[PDB]
Structure 1
């Protein structure tokens, strides 16, 4: 052992004193206590040591610094901080969705169709789409909404049976391209 003893004696004086020592008075303090001529390089040790002391520039020092003892060790260098308390994901529970944005153009007729398609693994067949519309939402509404196969093709995959455009089926297409 050697450098560990130099380390431990500077924390010993500074801890015993509690009130730190000015860097200019440190060398004669060291000479008095440990009977040795402090080399100038040990000042550089004092500047870098995280476990022995802290160099401080109190406002009254002006042109020199105080060596406080190691009580200020390990301030925010835990290297385990992400798991010391591991807080929940959001900024706070009141902010569970930091993101913001708006939905797509989906008027009530599109919404009726889109949910209605969602209710059936069978899809809705060309006649069953009107029947299920009127039954489920308890409405009797314009043929402009329930016979306009094109608007239904905006909300649904429309595909045919018995021939091209001979009989029709609807499956969900549920357009929601909006990301913001």
Structure 2
């Protein structure tokens, strides 16, 4: 052992004193206590040591610094901080969705069709789409909404049976391209 003893004696004086020592008075303090001429390089040790002391520039020092003892060790260098308390994901529970944005153009007729398609693994067949519309939402509404196969093709995959455009089926297409 050697450098560990130099380390431990500077924390010993500074801890015993509690009130730190000015860097200019440190060398004669060291000479008095440990009977040795402090080399100038040990000042550089004092500047870098995280476990022995802290160099401080109190406002009254002006042109020199105080060596406080190691009580200020390990301030925010835990290297385990992400798991010391591991807080929940959001900024706070009141902010569970930091993101913001708006939905797509989906008027009530599109919404009726889109949910209605969602209710059936069978899809809705060309006649069953009107029947299920009127039954489920308890409405009797314009043929402009329930016979306009094109608007239904905006909300649904429309595909045919018995021939091209001979009989029709609807499956969900549920357009929601909006990301913001």
2:119 corresponding residue in structure 1: 119
Deviations 1:61-97 (A, max 9, x none): 0000000000000000000000000000000000000
- Secondary structure of the corresponding residue to residue 105 of structure 1: coil
- The alpha-carbon deviation at position 106 of structure 1 amounts to 0.0
Two-structure CA RMSD over aligned residues (Å): 0.0
Structure 2: where are the runs of 5+ without partners?
none
TM-score by length of 2: 1.00
- The alpha-carbon deviation at position 101 of structure 1 amounts to 0.0
TM-score by length of 1: 1.00
Structure 1: where are the runs of 5+ without partners?
none
2:149 corresponding residue in structure 1: 149
Number of residues paired by the alignment? 180
- Secondary structure of the corresponding residue to residue 160 of structure 2: strand
- The alpha-carbon deviation at position 118 of structure 1 amounts to 0.0
- The alpha-carbon deviation at position 47 of structure 1 amounts to 0.0
- The alpha-carbon deviation at position 54 of structure 1 amounts to 0.0
C-alpha distance in 2 between matches for 1:178 and 1:124? 26
- Secondary structure of the corresponding residue to residue 76 of structure 2: coil
- Secondary structure of the corresponding residue to residue 178 of structure 1: coil
- The alpha-carbon deviation at position 140 of structure 1 amounts to 0.0
The 4+ residue runs of structure 1 with deviation greater than 6 A are: none
- The alpha-carbon deviation at position 138 of structure 1 amounts to 0.0
